[PDB]
Design an enzyme around this catalytic site. Sequence first.
Site, PDB file in Angstrom:
ATOM      1  N   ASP A 182       0.842  -1.193   0.000  1.00 55.21           N
ATOM      2  CA  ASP A 182       0.000   0.000   0.000  1.00 55.21           C
ATOM      3  C   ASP A 182       0.879   1.246   0.000  1.00 55.21           C
ATOM      4  OD1 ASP A 182      -2.123   1.914   0.430  1.00 55.21           O
ATOM      5  OD2 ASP A 182      -1.725   1.770   2.596  1.00 55.21           O
ATOM      6  N   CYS A 217      -1.616  -6.908 -14.120  1.00 54.49           N
ATOM      7  CA  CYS A 217      -1.981  -6.572 -12.779  1.00 54.49           C
ATOM      8  C   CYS A 217      -3.483  -6.475 -12.854  1.00 54.49           C
ATOM      9  CB  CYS A 217      -1.115  -5.332 -12.407  1.00 54.49           C
ATOM     10  SG  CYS A 217      -0.908  -4.065 -13.674  1.00 54.49           S
ATOM     11  N   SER A 218      -4.141  -5.149 -12.703  1.00 50.36           N
ATOM     12  CA  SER A 218      -5.545  -5.018 -13.167  1.00 50.36           C
ATOM     13  C   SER A 218      -5.616  -4.375 -14.546  1.00 50.36           C
ATOM     14  CB  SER A 218      -6.369  -4.201 -12.174  1.00 50.36           C
ATOM     15  OG  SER A 218      -7.719  -4.140 -12.589  1.00 50.36           O
ATOM     16  N   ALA A 219      -5.051  -3.182 -14.685  1.00 50.71           N
ATOM     17  CA  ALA A 219      -5.077  -2.462 -15.982  1.00 50.71           C
ATOM     18  C   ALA A 219      -3.936  -2.820 -16.920  1.00 50.71           C
ATOM     19  CB  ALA A 219      -5.069  -0.957 -15.750  1.00 50.71           C
ATOM     20  N   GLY A 220      -2.884  -3.443 -16.393  1.00 52.29           N
ATOM     21  CA  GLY A 220      -1.735  -3.804 -17.188  1.00 52.29           C
ATOM     22  C   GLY A 220      -0.795  -2.651 -17.469  1.00 52.29           C
ATOM     23  N   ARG A 223       1.564  -1.399 -11.842  1.00 55.78           N
ATOM     24  CA  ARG A 223       2.434  -2.393 -11.262  1.00 55.78           C
ATOM     25  C   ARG A 223       3.193  -3.129 -12.379  1.00 55.78           C
ATOM     26  NH1 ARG A 223      -1.584  -5.149  -6.760  1.00 55.78           N
ATOM     27  NH2 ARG A 223      -2.404  -3.117  -5.991  1.00 55.78           N
TER      28      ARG A 223
END
EC number: 3.1.3.48
Length: 282
Positions: A182, A217-220, A223
Site C-alpha cells: 500500500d 496486474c488489473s489495468a496492465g 504495477r
Amino acid sequence: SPSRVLQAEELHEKALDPFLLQAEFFEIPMNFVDPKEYDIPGLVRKNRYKTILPNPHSRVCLTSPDPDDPLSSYINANYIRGYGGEEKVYIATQGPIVSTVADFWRMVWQEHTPIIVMITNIEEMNEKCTEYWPEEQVAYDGVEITVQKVIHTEDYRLRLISLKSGTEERGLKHYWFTSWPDQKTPDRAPPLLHLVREVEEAAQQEGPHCAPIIVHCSAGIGRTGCFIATSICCQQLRQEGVVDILKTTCQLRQDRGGMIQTCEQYQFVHHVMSLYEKQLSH
C-alpha cells in the site's frame, strides 16, 4: 528520448527526493490511446477500463478462432521492448475478466509464452483479476491447462503448468506476487527485487530468444510497468553501472500508454534500484 543517467550516489538521493521525482514524472507523456481507435461493437466488454487501451502499433492481435473478426482478434495487450530495445521481451496486459479468460489463454498459446508474472494481492482477487488458472485442470479453445505443482515461497507462489493442445505440449511458469505494498516505502522493496531476479533467471533458462513474458496486474500499466522497468534497469545496472529510469519509462510509454501510472510507483522503482545498487556494491 528524455534521459537522466543515475550513478550510485545520485540514485540513492534521487529515490529520496519526492519533489524532484514528481517534477520529472509528470512531464513524461502518458501516451494514452484515443478510444475512437477501437470503436467496434462489443469491444468495450473486453476492456476493464475505457481509457486504458492498447496502442495500435504494438498491440497483440489474436489469430484464432477468427482472425477476420475484429472483436474475436482483440485483447488488451501490447508487446513491450526489453533492455537495449530488444523486441517483444514482454507482453503487458490487463488482468483477465470473465469474458476474456479464454482470450488470455489463446494469447499464451499463440505467443509460446513460457512465464507469466501476476502482480495482484489475494485481497484484490474480487476486483483486480479473475482467477484464470485451474485447481488441477481446465480447457479453453482446444488448449488444456494442467497445474502440475504449486510452490509457495515468501515473495511469490509459483505454479508449474503444462499446456497441451493437439499432440504438442509446453511448459509454463506462473509467478503470482502477492506482496504489493500500500505504502511504497523502501522497506517494501526487497520482495519485488527478488521477484524480478527470479523471473529474469527463469527467462535466461529458456535459452536464446525467449518468447514473450506476460506481465499483468488489473489495468496492465501500473504495477506491470514497475515490474518491467525494474527488470530492464537491473540489466542496465549490471551492464552499464548506471540506471536511466526516466529513459526506460519513456521507452515503456512508447510501447503502451500509462506504463508506471503513479508517482508513488515511479518512486518505488527508484527505491528498488537503489536497493539493488547497494546489494551489488557489497
